[PDB]
Amino acid sequence: QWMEGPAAVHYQPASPPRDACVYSSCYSEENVWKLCEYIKNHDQYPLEECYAVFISNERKMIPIWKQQARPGDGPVIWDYHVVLLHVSSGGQSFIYDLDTVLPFPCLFDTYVEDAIKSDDDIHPQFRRKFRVICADSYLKNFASDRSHMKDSSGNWREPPPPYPCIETGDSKMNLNDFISMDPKVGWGAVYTLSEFTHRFGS
């Protein structure tokens, strides 16, 4: 037997159940934005306990396992993917990924173990980096005009979410500043995989 050395065993999700959440395939940045907006207006948890987490790398090719778009034990190769992280007040973190086949929400360590996996044996150009943005800052600063989702003739590659493009007073499109893993760009903090797990894991 091994006893763990505040466990959030009664943790109440910060979002509605997965199938009740606003969701569009291939717009995870907006799906997460909508979760942040829900948390802000629901008055259950301080928004500052939550973060948007962009996952990407310099070559924009990252594997993520346990993804609904590819059932089985293989990864989806994304250009980037976004999830929500809730650091609950006791310190236990949870990941909210509407695209995972793991639970929604899922304990942080389990998500990293099963969906992310170690980078140590991954071919280096596929290794994962993480940009972590406070959910308050994400709601205040994110903007996307969805222009990256159109083909060479201007037609949608994937159908857009059923509400107007997210914009701010400062920008109508800055999605590249969140996908970028250059710490000199954008908002929040950039972590390698091992730095990310060291920071938020058990």
Amino acid residing at 88: S
Please count the structural domains in the chain. Answer: 1
Experimental method: X-ray
Burial of 4 (0-12, 13-18, 19+ CB in 10 A): exposed
The closest alpha carbon to 105, from 39, 185, 26, 175, belongs to 39
- The DSSP code sequence of the chain is --------TTPPPSS--GGGS---TT-HHHHHHHHHHHHHHH-SS-GGGEEEEEEE-TTS-EEESSBTTS-SSSPEEES-EEEEEEE-TTS-EEEE-TTBSS-SSEEHHHHIIIII--STTS-GGG--EEEEEEHHHHHHH-----GGGB-TTS-BSSPPPSSPPP--SS-S--THHHH---TTSSSSEEEEHHHHHHHH--
Is 184 a member of any domain? yes
Is 6 a member of any domain? no
Is 89 a member of any domain? yes
Rounded to a whole number, what is the largest CA-CA distance in the chain? Answer: 61
Is 45:14 a contact under the CB 8 Å cutoff?
yes
Q: Please give the Cα distance from 189 to 12 (Å, whole number).
A: 27
Distances (CA, A) of 142 to 21, 109, 187: 20, 27, 9
List, edge to edge, every strand of the sheet that includes 93-96.
Answer: 106-107, 93-96, 81-87, 50-56, 129-134, 189-192
Is 118 a member of any domain? yes
b (16+ CB within 10 A) / e for 71-100: eeeebeebebbbbbbbbbeeebbbbbbbbb
The closest alpha carbon to 85, from 168, 156, 14, belongs to 14
Is 169 a member of any domain? yes
> Which domain does 90 fall in, by range?
21-200
Is 8 a member of any domain? no
